[PDB]
Design a protein around this ligand. Structure first.
Ligand SMILES: Cc1ncc(CO)c(C=O)c1O
Ligand SMILES: [Ca+2]
Ligand SMILES: [Cl-]
Length: 223
């Protein structure tokens, strides 16, 4: 996250770190046994780390649970990042509490200047490299479909939205991938991609979760 703020320990209790010896991606806890992330975050040997603030210090609220199964979306395209969504089942149920809690799936999609909370352990610099140890937060509105398409010609599908600021300075960034965008208590986005970070006219692009809820519920109900 570039130009955001320190969230505060466990203030984003649905935020997960995906760990293959190091943090490589975010995710969102959607019930005691399931995480949603980006398909582009897929790899074997995932440990899900819940209850995390400092990803480099054991602070006392962590639950470390191995993935038993990963399900990349049937229609995921790695070239276009169309359908950039995957589900991860935990080998054991997370113990849900005030600091480890699932985030509601949407019943409807979000719209315009709906303010959203984007979070992750990604890079905090635009033209440098600094990875934070504690979770960073950005409040950002969803941008118009027309603005998003104008910003990224021939790249934005109906399964994508832009959120952030066309003036730049505030954005998601590398290592935020797969993390949440929460708008009025609902998981509406997954951190998907961008052109650099916090560049003018190049806001973050997000997986439109509302398109995927029937697939998420069907998949969870049969696995
Ligand atoms: C610009 C930019 N924005 C977001 C992400 C999230 O992964 C990445 C990397 O995957 C990136 O390069
Ligand atoms: Ca920790
Ligand atoms: Cl910078």
């Amino acid at each position: 996250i570039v130009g955001g703020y320190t969230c505060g320990a466990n203030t984003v209790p649905y935020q997960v770190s995906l760990n293959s010896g190091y943090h490589f991606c975010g995710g969102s806890l959607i019930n005691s046994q399931w995480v949603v992330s980006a398909a582009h975050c897929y790899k074997s040997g995932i440990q899900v780390r819940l209850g995390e603030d400092n990803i480099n210090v054991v602070e006392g609220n962590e639950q470390f649970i191995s993935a038993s199964k990963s399900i990349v979306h049937p229609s995921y395209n790695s070239n276009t990042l169309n359908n950039d969504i995957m589900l991860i089942k935990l080998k054991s149920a997370a113990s849900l509490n005030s600091r480890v809690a699932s985030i509601s799936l949407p019943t409807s999609c979000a719209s315009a200047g709906t303010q959203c909370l984007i979070s992750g352990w990604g890079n905090t610099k635009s033209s440098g490299t600094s990875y934070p140890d504690v979770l960073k937060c950005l409040k950002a509105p969803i941008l118009s479909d027309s603005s998003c398409k104008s910003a990224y010609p021939g790249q934005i599908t109906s399964n994508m939205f832009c959120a952030g600021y066309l003036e730049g300075g505030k954005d998601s960034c590398q290592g935020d991938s797969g993390g949440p965008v929460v708008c009025s208590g609902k998981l509406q986005g997954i951190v998907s991609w961008g052109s650099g970070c916090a560049q003018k006219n190049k806001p973050g692009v997000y997986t439109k979760v509302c398109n995927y809820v029937s697939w998420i519920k069907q998949t969870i109900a049969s696995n």
